[PDB]
Structure formats: C-alpha cells, structure tokens
Amino acid sequence: MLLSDRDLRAEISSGRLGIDPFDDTLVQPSSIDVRLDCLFRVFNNTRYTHIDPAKQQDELTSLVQPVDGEPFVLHPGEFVLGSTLELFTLPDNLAGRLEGKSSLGRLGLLTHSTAGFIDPGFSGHITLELSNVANLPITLWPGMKIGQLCMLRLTSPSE
Amino acid sequence: MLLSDRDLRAEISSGRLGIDPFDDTLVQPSSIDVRLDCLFRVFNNTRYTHIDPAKQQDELTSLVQPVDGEPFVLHPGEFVLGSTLELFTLPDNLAGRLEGKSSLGRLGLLTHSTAGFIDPGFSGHITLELSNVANLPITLWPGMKIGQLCMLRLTSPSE
Amino acid sequence: MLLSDRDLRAEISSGRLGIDPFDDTLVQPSSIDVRLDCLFRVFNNTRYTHIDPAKQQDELTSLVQPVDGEPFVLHPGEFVLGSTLELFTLPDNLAGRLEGKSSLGRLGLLTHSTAGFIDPGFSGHITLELSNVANLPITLWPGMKIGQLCMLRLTSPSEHP
Numbered sequence: 001m002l003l004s005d006r007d008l009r010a011e012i013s014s015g016r017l018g019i020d021p022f023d024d025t026l027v028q029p030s031s032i033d034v035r036l037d038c039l040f041r042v043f044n045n046t047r048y049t050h051i052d053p054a055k056q057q058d059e060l061t062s063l064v065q066p067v068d069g070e071p072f073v074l075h076p077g078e079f080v081l082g083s084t085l086e087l088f089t090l091p092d093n094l095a096g097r098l099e100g101k102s103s104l105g106r107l108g109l110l111t112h113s114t115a116g117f118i119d120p121g122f123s124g125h126i127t128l129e130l131s132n133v134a135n136l137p138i139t140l141w142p143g144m145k146i147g148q149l150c151m152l153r154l155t156s157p158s159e
Numbered sequence: 160m161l162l163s164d165r166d167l168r169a170e171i172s173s174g175r176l177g178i179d180p181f182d183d184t185l186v187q188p189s190s191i192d193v194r195l196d197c198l199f200r201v202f203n204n205t206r207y208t209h210i211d212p213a214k215q216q217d218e219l220t221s222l223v224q225p226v227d228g229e230p231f232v233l234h235p236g237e238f239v240l241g242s243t244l245e246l247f248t249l250p251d252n253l254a255g256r257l258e259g260k261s262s263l264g265r266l267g268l269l270t271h272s273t274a275g276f277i278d279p280g281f282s283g284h285i286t287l288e289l290s291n292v293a294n295l296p297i298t299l300w301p302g303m304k305i306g307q308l309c310m311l312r313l314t315s316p317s318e
Numbered sequence: 319m320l321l322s323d324r325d326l327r328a329e330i331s332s333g334r335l336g337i338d339p340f341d342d343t344l345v346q347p348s349s350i351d352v353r354l355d356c357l358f359r360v361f362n363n364t365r366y367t368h369i370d371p372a373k374q375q376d377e378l379t380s381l382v383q384p385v386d387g388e389p390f391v392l393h394p395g396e397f398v399l400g401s402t403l404e405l406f407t408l409p410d411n412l413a414g415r416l417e418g419k420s421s422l423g424r425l426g427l428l429t430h431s432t433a434g435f436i437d438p439g440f441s442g443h444i445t446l447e448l449s450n451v452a453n454l455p456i457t458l459w460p461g462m463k464i465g466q467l468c469m470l471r472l473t474s475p476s477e478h479p
Contacts, residue, residue: 001160001319002254004313029278029317030254043426043453050391050455051425053462073209079426079452095320095348105274105288107210108202108238113451115423117466120322120347129423131451133272133290134238135202137209144212148276153314154322155471158347160319161413163438163472188437188476189413232368264433264447266369267361267397292431292449293397294361296368303371307435312473 002030003094003151011094017151018089018123031099031148034084037125038142040064040072041081071139074109074132082128085143089123093157097150098126104146108134111147118149120158161189162253162310170253176310177248177282190258190307193243196284197301199223199231200240230298235267235291242284244302249281252316256309257285263305267293270306277308279317320348321412321469329412335469336407336441349417349466352402355443356460358382358390359399389457392427392450402444403461410438410476415468416446422464426452429465438472439479 003011005027011017019032026033041061048057061081066072074080090096096118100111110131118126128146132138162170164186170176178191185192200220207219220240225231233239249255257275259268273288287305291297321329323345329335337350344351359379369375379399384390392398408414414436418429428449436444446464450456458464 002311002313004315004317006318007314029280030313031276045453048454050457051452052389052457053422053425053427054457054459077453081424092347093322099276100272100274102274102286104212105272106240106286107212108273108288109212110272113418113423113428114426115418115420117349117417117468119349127420127424129426134210135204135236136207139209139211139213141213150276152320154320154348155325156322157324159323161470161472163474163476165475165477166473186478188410188439188479189472190435190437230370258435259431259433261433261445263371264431265399265445266371267432267447268371269431293369294363294395295366298368298370298372300372309435 001153003153004030008032008151011151016091017094018087020087028148031150033145033148034086034126036140036142036144036146037083037085038065039083043079066142071141074130074138074140076132076135076137078132080130082130084126084128084146087125088118090118090120092120093154095120095152095154096122097152099148099150101145101147107138108132109138120154160312162312163189167191167310170310175250176253177246179246187307190309192260192304192307193245193285195299195301195303195305196242196244197224198242202238230300232296233289233291233299234296235293237291239289241287241289243287246284247281249277249279251279252313254279254311254313255281256311258307258309260304260306266297267291268297279313319471321471322348326350326469329469334409335412336405338405346466349468351419351463351466352404352444354458354460354462354464355401355403356383357401361397384460389459391455391457392448393455394450394453396450398448400446400448402446405443407441408436408438410479411472413438413470413472414440415470416444417466417468419463419465425456426450427456438476
C-alpha cells in the first residue's frame with residue numbers, strides 16, 4: 001500500500017521516517033524525489049578476470065569525485081555505483097522502492113538496475129546503480145534530482 | 160495494495176479509471192494488458208556530442224513510423240521511445256506500475272527501463288522505453304500486446 | 319500491500335502459500351530470498367536472423383547445465399534464462415514481485431529485466447532473466463541466493479486466476 005504525500009508528511013513530521021536533509025518541495029503525489037551524491041565507485045577491470053560473488057575482491061572498485069564545477073560523464077555501457085544525497089531511516093512497518101523520474105527516463109538513464117528494494121529498518125544513504133542505455137554520453141551533476149522513493153506499508157510490523 | 164480483476168472492472172465500469180479503447184479480454188488476474196502504438200522516437204546522435212538533462216536539446220529525437228503492415232525492427236543496443244495504444248485516465252487514489260509480460264520477457268524485450276511509475280491523476284498515452292538485451296533483433300508489430308499495467312491503491316486520496 | 323515476515327510465515331505455515339523446498343532462514347523483513355537452479359537456456363543466434371514474437375520459434379534456445387562443482391559464467395552483454403530452485407504456489411489473493419539482492423545489485427547482476435511480476439494463482443518455478451551490465455564476467459553458482467520475492471496483498475481475491 002502506497003503512502004500518499006499527506007501520509008509521507010505525517011510519518012516524517014513524527015520522526016518515524018528519517019530523511020536528512022529534508023526538503024518539502026521534493027514530496028510528490030505518492031513518492032519523494034531523491035538527489036545525487038557526489039561520490040562514485042567505478043570498476044577496476046584491468047586487474048581481474050571476473051567477479052565471483054562467493055569471494056571477496058577488495059580492489060574491485062575505486063572511489064571517485066568530479067573536480068568542482070565538473071560533471072561525472074556516464075558513457076553507454078559503463079556501470080557505476082553512486083548514492084542518494086539524503087540519509088534515510090525507515091521504521092519497522094514501511095518498505096521503500098526506488099523509481100526513475102519520467103524526465104530522466106526518456107533520456108536513457110537507469111538509476112537502480114539490479115536493486116531498488118529497501119528493507120524496513122534500513123538506515124543509510126541509498127545505493128544507486130547507474131547505467132546509460134542511450135546512444136550518447138549523459139552528464140551527471142552532483143545534487144540533481146536523480147529519481148524518486150515510494151513508501152509501501154506492510155500488512156504488519158516486522159519481527 | 161494491488162487491485163484484482165474484479166476491482167479493476169469495478170473502477171472501469173464506473174468511469175473512475177479511464178481506458179480507451181477498452182477490451183475486456185485484456186484484463187488479467189491482477190493487471191491489464193496494454194498494446195503497442197505505431198509512432199516511435201529514435202535518437203539523432205550524429206548532431207550531438209551528449210545529452211544534458213539541464214538543457215533543452217531540441218532535435219535529439221525524431222518521429223518514426225513504419226509502413227502499415229511493417230514491423231519496427233529493434234536491434235540489440237538501440238534505445239527507442241514508444242507508447243501504449245490505449246489512453247489512460249487515473250483518479251487521485253490509484254497509481255500505476257508497468258510490468259513486462261512473461262512471454263516477451265523471455266525474448267529479451269524491455270518496455271519501461273528507466274521509468275514505469277505512473278502518478279495518480281495521470282492522463283495520456285503511457286510512454287514506453289524500448290530496449291533489446293537479447294542477441295538478435297526483435298520485430299515489433301504495432302497493436303501487439305507489449306506489457307501490463309497494475310493498479311495500486313493509495314492509503315488515501317492525494318492533494 | 320506488502321506482507322511482513324510474520325504474515326509470510328502465517329501464509330506458509332497454513333499452506334495457502336507454497337514454497338518447496340522451504341528454508342526459514344531465508345525469510346527477510348518483508349520478502350523471502352530465492353535461490354538459483356542449475357538449468358539455463360541460452361540463445362542460438364547463428365540459425366535465425368531475428369526474433370518474431372508473433373511466430374513460434376522452437377530451436378530458439380539451448381540447454382546449458384554447468385558441470386557439478388563448477389559455475390555458469392555470465393559475460394557482459396549475454397542474455398540467459400534461468401530458474402528459481404524453489405517451487406512456488408500462490409493463492410488467488412496474493413501477487414509476487416521479484417527484486418534484486420543489494421549485494422548482487424552492486425556487482426552488476428540483473429535477475430528479472432524484462433519480467434518480474436507473478437500473477438495470483440501462479441504455480442511453478444519462477445523464470446529468471448539473467449543479465450550482466452558490469453564490465454567483468456560474473457561466476458554464477460547454482461544454489462546461491464539470487465534474489466528476493468515480495469508478496470503483495472490484493473484488494474480482494476481474483477476472479478479469473
């Protein structure tokens with residue numbers, strides 16, 4: 001069951017749903033806009049033959065940050081990990097789903113391939129999986145609206 | 160909370176949910192099948208170096224229609240915009256989610272990458288984001304079943 | 319409306335939701351983890367020019383099964399069909415959604431592109447659409463946790479399951 005703007009505001013204004021930093025202009029009919037943080041992980045594929053989910057591979061990615069005033073350029077076929085600017089804190093009876101923005105959706109931008117489901121009790125910056133399936137580069141600006149977060153009510157609180 | 164066929168029928172036959180043209184055989188257990196319109200947008204990437212979400216890029220895409228009776232050929236790696244043949248009209252207490260059809264899913268077709276979340280209050284033809292992640296071209300026939308739309312009930316009407 | 323762990327347990331322990339084989343440690347706060355079965359279909363694209371959804375195309379896929387103890391290696395840009403090791407049986411008041419696991423999501427793994435919505439009344443092994451959008455190959459181990467399944471309550475039981 002999808003929380004409406006009024007219900008999202010009720011949950012926030014009562015501290016059961018944590019959103020830091022909070023911006024009320026971001027609340028939509030039945031969701032809230034999220035923004036792009038400025039740290040990214042790229043994959044170092046010249047040292048590894050392959051990914052093995054059963055193993056640990058601590059050189060698999062590196063942390064990056066665009067120079068001030070520069071964009072992060074996402075080329076078609078490149079896969080990179082980013083984060084929501086906001087820090088989220090969910091209670092025991094709400095789950096989250098990321099959805100794309102219609103705006104950026106028509107531009108070929110994917111934000112959560114891969115994984116956009118957020119467990120109740122979650123707390124942290126939401127991981128974004130960024131992809132471009134268009135046939136040009138897209139310039140990403142730290143701070144921009146990147147997608148939207150829906151809250152789903154559970155039939156009852158989690159054990 | 161997901162509307163059943165019975166409840167979808169109720170909403171439709173009461174005019175609260177607009178679907179034109181409607182076809183009863185399209186109703187599924189907890190969703191409604193949608194069909195492919197015949198107009199497509201392709202990207203004109205020979206005149207632009209890149210997409211910039213923050214600008215107006217005016218001839219980025221172009222209208223494309225195949226010959227009546229010809230398939231739109233969609234090759235792996237191409238990204239194209241299309242629409243549902245049906246015109247949708249949502250009330251203020253329901254939201255929509257596009258989902259793939261199991262049939263076309265197994266053939267490598269993606270229809271809403273990108274963006275498949277439809278706000279309550281929406282009215283129009285639903286935009287499709289078309290992609291082919293298989294290893295062969297897929298022939299698209301306008302009028303064919305392309306996917307399905309679910310209705311989610313909101314916790315309360317939106318502002 | 320999303321079933322919690324406690325409601326998923328009630329549905330299962332009363333037989334209205336079938337999961338075979340069932341393992342209680344896989345239950346998550348509002349979903350259940352699913353596992354990778356060992357048969358895969360790959361596409362034989364040297365015999366056809368194209369896929370046509372309106373025709374029947376029988377020699378379209380081929381059966382690949384990894385030797386035991388070894389993995390199915392999934393290269394970027396390849397598309398393969400797999401299956402949940404579990405058998406699911408849904409009653410007609412519940413629908414299912416596949417979602418990715420956070421851990422595999424950060425490795426570039428797609429499990430249900432394409433199609434992750436399960437109708438009420440469904441019964442069978444759930445089809446997985448496998449893709450790798452990373453820039454390395456990923457080794458898949460049959461039996462591994464591959465994703466999760468959420469249950470949605472319907473506003474009322476379905477008429478035409």
